Amino acid sequence: GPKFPRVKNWELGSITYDTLCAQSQQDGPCTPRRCLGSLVLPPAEQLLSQARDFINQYYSSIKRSGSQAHEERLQEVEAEVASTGTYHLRESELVFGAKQAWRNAPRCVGRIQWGKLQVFDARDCSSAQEMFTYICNHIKYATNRGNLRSAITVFPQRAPGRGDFRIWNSQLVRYAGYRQQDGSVRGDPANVEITELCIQHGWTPGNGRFDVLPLLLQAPDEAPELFVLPPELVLEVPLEHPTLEWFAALGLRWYALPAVSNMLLEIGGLEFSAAPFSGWYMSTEIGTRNLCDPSRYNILEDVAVCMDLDTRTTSSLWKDKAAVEINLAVLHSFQLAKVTIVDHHAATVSFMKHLDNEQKARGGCPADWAWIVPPISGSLTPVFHQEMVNYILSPAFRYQPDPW
């Protein structure tokens, strides 16, 4: 057979061969001795070439490969890199390659949509204030009354030893997390450290489970500045359950927009550091991950007592039963504010459609199985049975250090 990896789909029994990975100019975390798939955290020469690389990708997506437009941009960068030691992205490239990056992140079921993404250029940005309105612009656009829209705003790149452009928070939207004199945490304990940095960087706090965090921002070299969001700007959703009348009463809630912010966008060698993006939620992130992880909000037990469930015993499956209902109330509450959501089946079925598109076009789709298969009802979704190949294609997103 072919010498590239073979890829069976145990539901449909169908095979594909991933010829894409042949281009992963970037090593992972596995030796042939062992596999670290599970594992969550894992100067001229090499720039010139990483850049050359992306340009070639670019001209290929506009089908002009090998043509003079091409060898002329290649020499427009050689010029640039040689005599100054960087270069800049013609807007339209930044757009293509900001897509390429979403399309390339092997941990994201959301990709059918990859080609539908609004890139806003924010490369002119020159301050912590300017920064902010850019973001509010982003949020308004992409929240869009409730009819959510994939968006990414891109602030300036790394420069040779010049300050980096950082959004300090991980999301544009987090809830506060307040450490008790107990040892419990009031709010979302996900982000305590940051709730901390907030106060002792100027913020007068709140007293609530869902206190909407204000934004730590930071321009090159300048000290980190602290901006708060317009409240009528920040669309949340009260939660309720179609049938269980008492759910609405638990007083729970999430917020429309899922906006990642703490992550480095890497294109053709250049570094974006502050380039936050946001789509819409899949119902399991809210109702399983954020609301049910015990190292988070962890309601669950709570909901299952009102459920009338036998928790003394593990095997009554109260842990599961309850969580189903949670998600459903996550779903129903969203469906009902006319806000954009998408259940885990719905998402997976379309991610599968995606895999097939990528197949015809690029010859595979990098995937981090553990992350693609939803946190509940794994085996009931189609992806569960698709073997996946993971690898690192560039342009991509990188995890990056916290700025402190």
Q: What are the residues facing 271 on neighbouring strands?
A: 266
Residue found by looking up tokens 């409730």 in the block = 146
Q: Where are the beta strands (DSSP E) in 105-213?
A: 118-121, 151-154, 166-167, 177-179, 185-187
Sign, CA torsion 253/208/301/344: positive
Question: Residue 4 or 384: which CB sits closer to ligand H4B?
Answer: 384
Q: What does the alpha-carbon distance between residue 167 and residue 188 come to, in Å, rounded to a whole number?
A: 19
Tell me whether residue 111 is one of the annotated catalytic residues: yes
Selecting among 73, 102, 108, 174, the annotated active-site residue is: 108
Selecting among 73, 103, 111, 158, the annotated active-site residue is: 111
Q: Applying CB under 6 A, which of residues 104, 157, 171, 290 lies at the interface with ligand XFN?
A: 171
370 touches Zn ion by CB under 5 A: no
Q: Which helix (DSSP H) or strand (DSSP E) does residue 270 occupy?
A: strand 270-271
Tell me whether residue 108 is one of the annotated catalytic residues: yes
Partner from ligand XFN, ligand HEM, ligand H4B, none contacting 370, C-beta within 5 to 8 A by type: ligand H4B
Q: What does the alpha-carbon distance between residue 17 and residue 76 come to, in Å, rounded to a whole number?
A: 37
Tell me whether residue 285 is one of the annotated catalytic residues: yes
Shortest reach from residue 289's CB to ligand H4B, in Å: 6
Backbone angles phi, psi at 73, to 5 degrees: -70, -40
3-state secondary structure of 225: strand
Question: Residue 35 or 69: which CB sits closer to ligand H4B?
Answer: 35
398 touches ligand HEM by CB under 6 A: no
Q: What does the alpha-carbon distance between residue 286 and residue 293 come to, in Å, rounded to a whole number?
A: 10
107 touches ligand HEM by CB under 6 A: yes
What is the DSSP-derived secondary structure letter of residue 332? H
203 touches ligand H4B by CB under 6 A: no
Q: Applying CB under 6 A, which of residues 55, 108, 329, 393 lies at the interface with ligand HEM?
A: 108
**Contact partners, residue 102, CB within 8 Å, separation at least 6:** 108, 110, 111, 114, 117, 150, 277
39 touches Zn ion by CB under 5 A: no
Choose one: 42-50, 109-117, 122-130, 228-236; the region binding ligand HEM (CB under 6 A): 109-117
210 touches ligand HEM by CB under 6 A: no
Strand 259-260 and strand 253-255: the pairing is unpaired
Catalytic annotation, residues? 108, 111, 280, 285
Which positions touch Zn ion (CB under 5 A)? 30, 35, 37
Binding site for ligand H4B (CB under 6 A): 10, 38, 40, 289, 370-371, 375, 385-387
Contact residues toward ligand HEM (CB under 6 A) are 102, 105, 107-110, 113, 117, 150, 152, 277, 279-280, 282, 285, 289, 342, 347, 371, 397
